[PDB]
Write a protein that binds this ligand. Structure first.
Ligand SMILES: CCCc1cc(=O)n2nc(NCc3c(F)cc(Cl)cc3F)c(C#N)c2[nH]1
Ligand SMILES: CCCc1cc(=O)n2nc(NCc3c(F)cc(Cl)cc3F)c(C#N)c2[nH]1
Ligand SMILES: *Cc1c(COP(=O)(O)O)cnc(C)c1O
Ligand SMILES: *Cc1c(COP(=O)(O)O)cnc(C)c1O
Ligand SMILES: [Mg+2]
Lengths: 365, 366
């Protein structure tokens, strides 16, 4: 039981460097930088020294448990080139906390969160010219942790690989504006269950999503609204946390989001939005159950203001419609500004690009 | 695009150095691999490439491959058996091809021609046929595997995939080669699968989530997990195996019971074979029915339980001796009852697998 250390980094620079992309023509998660971080683990010898080396294919035994039994987890965070040309990470300690917690739940080996964050800092530093020269683009950082056990028994792995990829990305939507989405709400598909891994960023949570999203697209919708339970609770939207801004049953202005009862991924963006809403103290902030009946009752009383997803790749993604029980239900998000969604995006973007000082950002090592 | 690969297009790159075969008595499940593997690449742009049989070697995967990030992956498990007549047989391999195809559609992995995949698997086993053990208690495990190799990090249907097949010689699941009854850990805190989920498919995402509960079982002195579901603590599966209960039921009737295929149970090939045999014998009631922990503890207090066992490909029939539940150890008298039915099932399935009797369930290697 132990950790790799950043002071042990072995750095092998690429001798052929790739052209950087146009920061205005960027598709999320498609372009990769020159270098990656890799760290090997075995039960026999523990953590090997960490390597920063050229981006390359992984060489994996075909029996590797990541390939058979989804022994795998990941993270997602961003580096931003500030208005002052200082590169900043955003809330990276929250990602290290979540990745450590996911590793325990996956039965992958633990590591020192500060050692991994310093290894990520050194990788971004080497590839810093990849952090785009744009106030609407960023560098996506993908820490990934896989079982590489070369045996077909279903068991805790005795071999693993932790690696980090970098990808320059633009706005999630090419327009760089709000592209409000239609949601497909079919209770036939359930993303997560009590006693499952839905509250960890484990790869096994995401395999089911593709089929339901393909069905959404066949029915003229862009994303899945994940429903849970006999009362059709609204939980998450695609790969994003779900917020509802409304007048509640008590006549109170409220920002509501489902609570962390085991079927909700505790998003870093979700945490930030709840912290902002509590700080502003302008309306009620509630982690509470929201059902489709709660929503349709509110819509018929003109009580709904905004619905939006939260997540790293999109930040704030408004919802305009839900298809449920054969009816298209309009959500008036875009007819209400969307004032709160816009205020949140502006605040987070100002912090990310260093337009205001914050404890939420760390300058590049 | 090429809609499916064909076996007639197989490219064979033989290994030039062959490995020493293992002792068929000293085999740990899924640890030893044969000389060759099958690989077939797919892209949305061009469809399926030609299939390759080549030496076992590492895969070269883009680190963004969706199998590694979002568990875009599934597998199968089936066996080849060297008969008492030295003919190698497969056991209902078309059921595995059907299950794998159905899982691929649910995963959004590309379709393939099930007959062409089975012919490629036959050619791979034929090349590595000396790996099929010279033992009536050992077999060759076949692991078809299908992974998303999409390099991009969006959560989306893959535009690149790899279908591959590994072979692994395996002995009895336990080195003793006799029944090693297990103790089960029953904790309703963890759930394997749920209604609206993918528990009825061999998708890798069903297994990664299970390891934590298995580790908790082991540190509480148990070998396997009894998977509970719902407010009434339905008993569903035992480890990675289907669950059978042989008992006198609530109505006083001798009964072999197993949970029903309601979407949270893997539809095991061994499970369906056991139900088919039990219906054919007609010596007791055969029921696909819900079973709860209360049903089981009530039966045990009434001395109504005869045998409990798992069914699956790697073990065939795996008896259960004990369950740890609500802080108490509950003895299951499987081994004090022979176990007569478990032994009879094992003997019948092994007689079919090793060609001691003719069966529509076996196919001789082409
Ligand atoms: C898994 C981590 C990487 C990642 C991959 C991926 O494919 N997506 N897609 C995202 N947004 C699509 C989307 C939308 F555009 C709108 C709504 Cl309401 C809901 C929604 F999910 C986001 C985000 N944020 C994201 N992140
Ligand atoms: C996933 C497919 C490959 C595979 C991997 C693996 O680790 N196992 N372990 C198995 N048997 C352990 C076990 C037991 F020994 C006894 C009982 Cl009651 C329940 C049980 F699961 C079996 C079987 N059959 C199996 N198959
Ligand atoms: C990552 C993730 C979230 C939250 O994303 P953040 O980028 O941490 O805000 C929500 N739901 C799912 C399924 C996720 O994978
Ligand atoms: C593979 C598997 C079984 C057994 O299926 P067979 O086709 O008999 O090998 C049972 N339960 C689970 C969860 C499985 O993965
Ligand atoms: Mg054909």
């Amino acid at each position: 039981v132990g950790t790799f250390k950043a002071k042990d980094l072995i750095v092998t620079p690429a001798t052929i460097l790739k052209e950087k992309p146009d920061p205005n023509n960027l598709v999320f998660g498609t372009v990769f930088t020159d270098h990656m971080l890799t760290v090997e683990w075995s039960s026999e010898f523990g953590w090997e020294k960490p390597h920063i080396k050229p981006l390359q294919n992984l060489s994996l035994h075909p029996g590797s448990s990541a390939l058979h039994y989804a022994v795998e987890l990941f993270e997602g965070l961003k580096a931003f080139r500030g208005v002052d040309n200082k590169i900043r990470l955003f809330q990276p300690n929250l990602n290290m906390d979540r990745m450590y917690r996911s590793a325990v739940r996956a039965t992958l080996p633990v590591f020192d969160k500060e050692e991994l964050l310093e290894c990520i800092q050194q990788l971004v530093k080497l590839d810093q010219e990849w952090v785009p020269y744009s106030t609407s683009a960023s560098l996506y950082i993908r820490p990934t942790f896989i079982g590489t056990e070369p045996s077909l028994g279903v068991k805790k792995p005795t071999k693993a690989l932790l690696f980090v990829l970098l990808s320059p990305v633009g706005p999630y939507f090419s327009s760089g504006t709000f592209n409000p989405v239609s949601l497909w709400a079919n209770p036939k598909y359930v993303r997560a269950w009590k006693g499952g891994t839905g509250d960890c960023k484990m790869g096994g949570n995401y395999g089911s999503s593709l089929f339901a999203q393909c069905e959404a697209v066949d029915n003229g919708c862009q994303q899945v609204l994940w429903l849970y339970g006999e009362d059709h609770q609204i939980t998450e939207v695609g790969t994003m946390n779900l917020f509802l801004y409304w007048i509640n049953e008590d006549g109170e202005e409220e920002l509501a989001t489902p609570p962390l009862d085991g079927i909700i991924l505790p998003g870093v963006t979700r945490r930030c939005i709840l912290d902002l809403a509590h700080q502003w103290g302008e309306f009620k902030v509630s982690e509470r159950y929201l059902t489709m009946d709660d929503l349709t009752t509110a819509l018929e009383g003109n009580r709904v203001r905004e619905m939006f997803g939260s997540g790293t790749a999109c930040v704030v993604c408004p919802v305009s419609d839900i298809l449920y029980k054969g009816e298209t239900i309009h959500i008036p998000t875009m007819e209400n500004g969307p004032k709160l969604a816009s205020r949140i995006l502006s605040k987070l973007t100002d912090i990310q690009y260093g337009r205001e000082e914050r404890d939420w950002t760390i300058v590049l090592s």
